[PDB]
Amino acid sequence: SFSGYLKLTDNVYIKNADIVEEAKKVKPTVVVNAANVYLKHGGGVAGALNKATNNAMQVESDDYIATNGPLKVGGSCVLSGHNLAKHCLHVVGPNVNKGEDIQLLKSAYENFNQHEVLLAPLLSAGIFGADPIHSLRVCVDTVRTNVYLAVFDKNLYDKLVSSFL
Numbered sequence: 001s002f003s004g005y006l007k008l009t010d011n012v013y014i015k016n017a018d019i020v021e022e023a024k025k026v027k028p029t030v031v032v033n034a035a036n037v038y039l040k041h042g043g044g045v046a047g048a049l050n051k052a053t054n055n056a057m058q059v060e061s062d063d064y065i066a067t068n069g070p071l072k073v074g075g076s077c078v079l080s081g082h083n084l085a086k087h088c089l090h091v092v093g094p095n096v097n098k099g100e101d102i103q104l105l106k107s108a109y110e111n112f113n114q115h116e117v118l119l120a121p122l123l124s125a126g127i128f129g130a131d132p133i134h135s136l137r138v139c140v141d142t143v144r145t146n147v148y149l150a151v152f153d154k155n156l157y158d159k160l161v162s163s164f165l
């Protein structure tokens with residue numbers, strides 16, 4: 001199971017880790033992807049997860065979009081986890097760099113409540129432009145299921161833990 005995590009709350013755990021390496025090690029039931037509405041996994045966590053699947057995540061995602069159309073900001077879909085997990089929960093947090101409503105971050109985290117346990121990144125953090133401290137606060141105040149957060153950046157991990165209320 002998950003190891004080396006700091007406990008933040010009854011159900012939220014955090015570790016300074018590369019989510020791809022963490023997923024390959026744990027092979028969790030669910031890995032969360034920091035997806036966009038088009039499931040175009042170009043960069044950030046999505047680009048890294050997709051590259052780890054040898055692009056199989058992108059091939060599956062293009063078929064999903066061709067059939068269903070784009071996701072909503074704040075929405076999600078469950079697809080295969082490929083070699084990383086049983087399932088990948090593609091969750092769309094608002095991208096502040098595209099002028100999307102930060103208020104949708106709570107709706108994005110609510111998707112996690114449909115899964116008993118998840119390995120996840122902080123939604124809307126990184127290239128999505130939101131404040132990761134705010135993302136962690138919304139996470140702990142929204143998610144009720146067991147969420148294991150992987151924060152790639154050591155300096156950001158330290159800032160998140162030390163400023164956690």
Ligand SMILES: C[C@H]1C(=O)NC(=O)N1c1ccc(Cl)cc1
Pocket residue numbers: 044045121122125126127132150151152153154156157
């Ligand atoms: C991409 C995001 C993540 O999932 N884990 C991180 O440490 N992230 C990250 C966010 C902001 C900056 Cl400047 C650097 C890294």
